[PDB]
Short mmCIF file of N, CA and C and ligand atoms in Angstrom, two decimals:
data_model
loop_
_atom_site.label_atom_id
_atom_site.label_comp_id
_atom_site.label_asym_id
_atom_site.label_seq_id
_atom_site.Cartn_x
_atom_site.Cartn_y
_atom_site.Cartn_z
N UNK A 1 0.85 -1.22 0.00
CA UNK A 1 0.00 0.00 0.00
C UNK A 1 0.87 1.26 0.00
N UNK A 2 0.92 2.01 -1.57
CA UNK A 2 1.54 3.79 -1.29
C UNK A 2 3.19 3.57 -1.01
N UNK A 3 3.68 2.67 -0.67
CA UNK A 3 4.89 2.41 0.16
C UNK A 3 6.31 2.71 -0.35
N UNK A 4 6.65 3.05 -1.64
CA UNK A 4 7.71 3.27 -2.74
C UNK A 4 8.21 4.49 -2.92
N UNK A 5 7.77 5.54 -2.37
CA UNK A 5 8.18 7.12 -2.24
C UNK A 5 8.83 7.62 -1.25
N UNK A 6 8.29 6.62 -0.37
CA UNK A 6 8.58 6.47 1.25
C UNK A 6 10.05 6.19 1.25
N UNK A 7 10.31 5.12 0.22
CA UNK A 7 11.76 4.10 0.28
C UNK A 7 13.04 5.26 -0.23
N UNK A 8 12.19 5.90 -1.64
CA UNK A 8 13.01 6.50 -2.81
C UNK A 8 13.20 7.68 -2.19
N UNK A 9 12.64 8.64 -1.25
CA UNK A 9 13.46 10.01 -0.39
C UNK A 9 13.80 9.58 0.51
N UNK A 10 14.06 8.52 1.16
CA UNK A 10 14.78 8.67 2.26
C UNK A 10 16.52 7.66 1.61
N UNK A 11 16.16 7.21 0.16
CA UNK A 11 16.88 7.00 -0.05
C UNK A 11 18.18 8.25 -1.07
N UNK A 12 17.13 8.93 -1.32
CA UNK A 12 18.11 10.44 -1.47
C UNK A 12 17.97 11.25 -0.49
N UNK A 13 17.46 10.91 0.52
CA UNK A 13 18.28 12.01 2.30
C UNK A 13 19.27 11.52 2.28
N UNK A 14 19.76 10.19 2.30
CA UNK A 14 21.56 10.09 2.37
C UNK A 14 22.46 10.55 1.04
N UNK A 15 21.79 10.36 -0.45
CA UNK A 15 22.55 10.86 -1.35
C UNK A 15 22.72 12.83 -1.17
N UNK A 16 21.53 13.27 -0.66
CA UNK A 16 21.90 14.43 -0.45
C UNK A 16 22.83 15.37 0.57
N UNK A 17 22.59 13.74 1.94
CA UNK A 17 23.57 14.42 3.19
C UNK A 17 25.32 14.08 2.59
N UNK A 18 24.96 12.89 1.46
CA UNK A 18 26.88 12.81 1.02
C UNK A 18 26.75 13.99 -0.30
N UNK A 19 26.38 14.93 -0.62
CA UNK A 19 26.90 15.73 -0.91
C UNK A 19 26.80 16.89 0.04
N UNK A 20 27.02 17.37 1.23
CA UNK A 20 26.71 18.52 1.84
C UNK A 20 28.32 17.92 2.86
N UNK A 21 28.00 16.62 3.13
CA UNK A 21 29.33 15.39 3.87
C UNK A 21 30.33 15.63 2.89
N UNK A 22 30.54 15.77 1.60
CA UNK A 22 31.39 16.18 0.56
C UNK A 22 31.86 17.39 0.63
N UNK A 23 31.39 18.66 0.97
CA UNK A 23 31.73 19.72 1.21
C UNK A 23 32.86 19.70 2.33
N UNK A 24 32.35 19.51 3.34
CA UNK A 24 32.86 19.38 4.89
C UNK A 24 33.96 18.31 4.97
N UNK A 25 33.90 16.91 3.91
CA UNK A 25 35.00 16.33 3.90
C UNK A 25 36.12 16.47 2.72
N UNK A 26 36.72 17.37 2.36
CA UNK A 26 37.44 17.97 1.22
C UNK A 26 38.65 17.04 1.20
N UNK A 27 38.94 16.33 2.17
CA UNK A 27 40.40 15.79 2.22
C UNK A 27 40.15 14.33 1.46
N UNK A 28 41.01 14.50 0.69
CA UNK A 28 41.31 12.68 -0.50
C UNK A 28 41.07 11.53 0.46
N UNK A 29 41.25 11.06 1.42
CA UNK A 29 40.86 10.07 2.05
C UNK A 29 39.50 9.99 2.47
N UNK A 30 38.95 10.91 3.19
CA UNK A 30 37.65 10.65 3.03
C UNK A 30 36.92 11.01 1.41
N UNK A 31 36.90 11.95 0.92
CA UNK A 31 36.58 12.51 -0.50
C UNK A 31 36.39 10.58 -1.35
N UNK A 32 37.13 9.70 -1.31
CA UNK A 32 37.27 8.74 -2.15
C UNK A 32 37.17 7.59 -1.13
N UNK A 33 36.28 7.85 -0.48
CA UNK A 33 35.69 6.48 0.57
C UNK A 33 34.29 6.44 0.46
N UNK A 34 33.54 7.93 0.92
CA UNK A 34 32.28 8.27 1.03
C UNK A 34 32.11 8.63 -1.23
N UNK A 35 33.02 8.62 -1.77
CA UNK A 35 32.53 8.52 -3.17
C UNK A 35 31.97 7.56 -3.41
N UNK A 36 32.11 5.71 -3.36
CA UNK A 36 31.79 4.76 -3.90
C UNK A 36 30.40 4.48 -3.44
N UNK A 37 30.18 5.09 -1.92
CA UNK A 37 28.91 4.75 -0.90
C UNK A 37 27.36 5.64 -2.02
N UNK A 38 28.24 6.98 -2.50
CA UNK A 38 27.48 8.05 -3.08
C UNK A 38 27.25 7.16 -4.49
N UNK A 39 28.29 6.72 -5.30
CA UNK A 39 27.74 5.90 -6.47
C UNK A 39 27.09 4.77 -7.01
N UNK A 40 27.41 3.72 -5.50
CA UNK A 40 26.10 3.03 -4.65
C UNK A 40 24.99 3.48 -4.75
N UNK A 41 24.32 4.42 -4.14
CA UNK A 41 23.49 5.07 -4.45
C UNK A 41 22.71 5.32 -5.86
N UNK A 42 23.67 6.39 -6.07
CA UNK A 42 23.17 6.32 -7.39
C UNK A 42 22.67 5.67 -8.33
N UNK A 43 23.43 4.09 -8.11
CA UNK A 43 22.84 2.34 -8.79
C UNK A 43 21.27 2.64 -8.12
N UNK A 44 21.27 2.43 -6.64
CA UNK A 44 19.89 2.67 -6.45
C UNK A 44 18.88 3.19 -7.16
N UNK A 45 19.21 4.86 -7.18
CA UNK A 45 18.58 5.71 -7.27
C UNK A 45 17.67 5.83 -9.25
N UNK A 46 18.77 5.01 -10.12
CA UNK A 46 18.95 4.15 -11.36
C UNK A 46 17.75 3.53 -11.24
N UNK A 47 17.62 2.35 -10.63
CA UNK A 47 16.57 1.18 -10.76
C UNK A 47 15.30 1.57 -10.28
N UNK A 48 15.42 2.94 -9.07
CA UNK A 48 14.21 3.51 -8.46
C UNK A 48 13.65 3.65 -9.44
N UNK A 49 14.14 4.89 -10.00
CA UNK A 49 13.36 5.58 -11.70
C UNK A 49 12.90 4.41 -12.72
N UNK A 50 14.00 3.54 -12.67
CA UNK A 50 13.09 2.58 -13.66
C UNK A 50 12.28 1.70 -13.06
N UNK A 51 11.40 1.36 -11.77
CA UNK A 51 10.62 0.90 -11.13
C UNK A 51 9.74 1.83 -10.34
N UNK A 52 9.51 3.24 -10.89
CA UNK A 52 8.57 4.19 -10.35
C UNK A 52 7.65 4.10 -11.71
N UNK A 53 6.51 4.15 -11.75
CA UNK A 53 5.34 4.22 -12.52
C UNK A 53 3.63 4.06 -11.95
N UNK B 1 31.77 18.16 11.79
CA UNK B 1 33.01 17.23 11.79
C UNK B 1 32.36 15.95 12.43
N UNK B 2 31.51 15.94 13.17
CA UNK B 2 31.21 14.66 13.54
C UNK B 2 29.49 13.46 12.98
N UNK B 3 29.18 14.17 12.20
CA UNK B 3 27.88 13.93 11.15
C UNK B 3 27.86 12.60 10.78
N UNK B 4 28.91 11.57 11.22
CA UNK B 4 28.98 10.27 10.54
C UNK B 4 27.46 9.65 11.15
N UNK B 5 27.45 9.91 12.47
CA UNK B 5 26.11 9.26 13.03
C UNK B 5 24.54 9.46 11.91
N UNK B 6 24.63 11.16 11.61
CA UNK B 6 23.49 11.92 11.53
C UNK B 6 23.35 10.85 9.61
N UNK B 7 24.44 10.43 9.03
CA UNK B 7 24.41 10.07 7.69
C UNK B 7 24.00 8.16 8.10
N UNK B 8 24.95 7.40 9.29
CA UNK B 8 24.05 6.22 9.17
C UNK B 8 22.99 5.85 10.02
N UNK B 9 22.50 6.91 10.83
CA UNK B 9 20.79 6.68 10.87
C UNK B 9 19.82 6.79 10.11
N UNK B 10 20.33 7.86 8.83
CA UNK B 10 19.55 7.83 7.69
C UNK B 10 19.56 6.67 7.26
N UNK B 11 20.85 6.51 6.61
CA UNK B 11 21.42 4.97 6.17
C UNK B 11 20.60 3.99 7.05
N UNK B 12 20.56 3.93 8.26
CA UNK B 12 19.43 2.50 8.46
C UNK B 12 18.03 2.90 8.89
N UNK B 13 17.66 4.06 8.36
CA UNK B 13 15.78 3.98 8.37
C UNK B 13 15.67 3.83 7.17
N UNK B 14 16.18 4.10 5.88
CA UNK B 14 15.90 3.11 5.05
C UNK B 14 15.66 1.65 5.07
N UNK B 15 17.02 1.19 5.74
CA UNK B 15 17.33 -0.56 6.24
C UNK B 15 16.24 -0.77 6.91
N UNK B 16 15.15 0.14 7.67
CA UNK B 16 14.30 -0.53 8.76
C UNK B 16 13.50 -0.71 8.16
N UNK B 17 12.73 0.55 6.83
CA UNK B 17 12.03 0.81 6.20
C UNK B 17 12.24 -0.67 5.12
N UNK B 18 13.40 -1.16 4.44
CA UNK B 18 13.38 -1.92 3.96
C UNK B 18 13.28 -3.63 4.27
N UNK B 19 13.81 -3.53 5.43
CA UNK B 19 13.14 -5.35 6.04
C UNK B 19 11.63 -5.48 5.75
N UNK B 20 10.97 -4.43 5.96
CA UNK B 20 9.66 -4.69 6.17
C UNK B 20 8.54 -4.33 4.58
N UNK B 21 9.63 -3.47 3.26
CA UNK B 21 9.70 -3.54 2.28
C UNK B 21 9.77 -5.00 1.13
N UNK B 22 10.77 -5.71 1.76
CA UNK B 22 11.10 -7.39 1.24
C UNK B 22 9.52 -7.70 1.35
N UNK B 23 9.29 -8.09 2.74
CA UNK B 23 7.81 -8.78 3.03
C UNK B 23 6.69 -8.25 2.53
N UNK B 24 6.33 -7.26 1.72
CA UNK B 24 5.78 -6.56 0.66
C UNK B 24 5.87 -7.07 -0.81
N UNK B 25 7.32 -7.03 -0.90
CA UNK B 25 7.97 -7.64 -1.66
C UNK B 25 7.95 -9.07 -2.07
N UNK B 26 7.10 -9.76 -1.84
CA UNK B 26 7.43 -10.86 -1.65
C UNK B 26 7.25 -11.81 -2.67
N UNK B 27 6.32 -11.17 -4.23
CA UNK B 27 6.91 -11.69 -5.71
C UNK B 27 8.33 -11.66 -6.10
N UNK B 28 9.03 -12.74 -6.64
CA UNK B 28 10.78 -12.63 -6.68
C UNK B 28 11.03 -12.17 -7.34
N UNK B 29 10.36 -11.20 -8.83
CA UNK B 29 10.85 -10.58 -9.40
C UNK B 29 11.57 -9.10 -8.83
N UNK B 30 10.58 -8.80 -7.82
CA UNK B 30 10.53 -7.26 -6.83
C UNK B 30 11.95 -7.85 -5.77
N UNK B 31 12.07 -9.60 -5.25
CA UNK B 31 12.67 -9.90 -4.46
C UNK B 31 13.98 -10.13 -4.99
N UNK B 32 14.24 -9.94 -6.16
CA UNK B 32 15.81 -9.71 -7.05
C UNK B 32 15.86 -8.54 -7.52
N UNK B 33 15.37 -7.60 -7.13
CA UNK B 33 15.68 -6.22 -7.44
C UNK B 33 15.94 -5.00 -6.22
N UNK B 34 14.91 -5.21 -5.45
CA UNK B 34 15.15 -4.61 -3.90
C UNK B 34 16.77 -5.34 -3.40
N UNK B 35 16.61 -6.61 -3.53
CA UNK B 35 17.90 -7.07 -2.84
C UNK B 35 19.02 -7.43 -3.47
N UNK B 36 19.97 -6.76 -4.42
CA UNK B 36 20.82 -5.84 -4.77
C UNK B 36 20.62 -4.14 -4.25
N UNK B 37 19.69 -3.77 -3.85
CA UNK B 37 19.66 -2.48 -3.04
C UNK B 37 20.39 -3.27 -1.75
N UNK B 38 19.49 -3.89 -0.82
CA UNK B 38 19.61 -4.87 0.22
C UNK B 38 21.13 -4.94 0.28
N UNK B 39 21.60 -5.76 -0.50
CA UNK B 39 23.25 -6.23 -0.56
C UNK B 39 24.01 -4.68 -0.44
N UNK B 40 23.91 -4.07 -0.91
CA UNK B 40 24.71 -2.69 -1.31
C UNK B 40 24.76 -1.53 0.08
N UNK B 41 23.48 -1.98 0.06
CA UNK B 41 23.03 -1.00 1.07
C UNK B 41 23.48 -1.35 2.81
N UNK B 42 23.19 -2.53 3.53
CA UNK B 42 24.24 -3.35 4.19
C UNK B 42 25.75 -2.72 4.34
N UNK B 43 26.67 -3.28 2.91
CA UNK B 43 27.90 -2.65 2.81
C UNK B 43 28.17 -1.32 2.97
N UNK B 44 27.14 -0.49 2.80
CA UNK B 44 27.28 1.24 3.49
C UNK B 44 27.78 0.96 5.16
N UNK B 45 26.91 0.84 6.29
CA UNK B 45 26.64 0.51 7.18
C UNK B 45 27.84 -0.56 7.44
N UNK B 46 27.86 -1.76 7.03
CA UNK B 46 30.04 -2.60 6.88
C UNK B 46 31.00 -1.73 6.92
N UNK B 47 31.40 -0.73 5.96
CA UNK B 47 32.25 0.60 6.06
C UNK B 47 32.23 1.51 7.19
N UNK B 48 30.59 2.02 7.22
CA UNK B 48 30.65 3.11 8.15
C UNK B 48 31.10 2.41 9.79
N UNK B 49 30.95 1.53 10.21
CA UNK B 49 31.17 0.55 11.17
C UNK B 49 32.68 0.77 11.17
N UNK B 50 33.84 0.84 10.53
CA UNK B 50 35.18 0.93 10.19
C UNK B 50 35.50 2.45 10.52
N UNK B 51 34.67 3.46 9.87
CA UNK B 51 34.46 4.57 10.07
C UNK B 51 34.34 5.20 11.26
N UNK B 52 33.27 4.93 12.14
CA UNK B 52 33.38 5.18 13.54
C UNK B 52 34.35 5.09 14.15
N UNK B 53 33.74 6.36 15.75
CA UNK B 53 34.85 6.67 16.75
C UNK B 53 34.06 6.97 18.07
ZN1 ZN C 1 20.54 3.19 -1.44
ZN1 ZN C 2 23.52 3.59 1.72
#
């Protein structure tokens, strides 16, 4: 029931807190740790759109 | 500087949101697609675990 919108923003509240976490972490070690977690995401965020209709 | 918390509580109200997503889920076409989120999403939360202080 309704339940898929619910999943898909709270699954871009974290893609949006790792870019604001991107700002604040400028240094190459973190910068290229919290990157792969963010492009993770993004796979998500991929299959959301093609399973929203 | 210390936001790692504020990024994996997001990170697992999705995860909470999603256990109970699967059982919704529970045609295997939906149940091989959520879980590659599932798998991925886990490994956020594996890292951030390394991450902590
Ligand atoms: Zn995700
Ligand atoms: Zn995640």
């Amino acid at each position: 029931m309704d339940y898929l919108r619910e999943l898909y923003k709270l699954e871009q509240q974290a893609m949006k807190l790792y870019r604001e976490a991107s700002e604040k972490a400028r240094n190459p070690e973190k910068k290229s740790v919290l990157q792969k977690i963010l492009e993770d995401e993004e796979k998500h965020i991929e299959w959301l759109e093609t399973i929203n209709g």
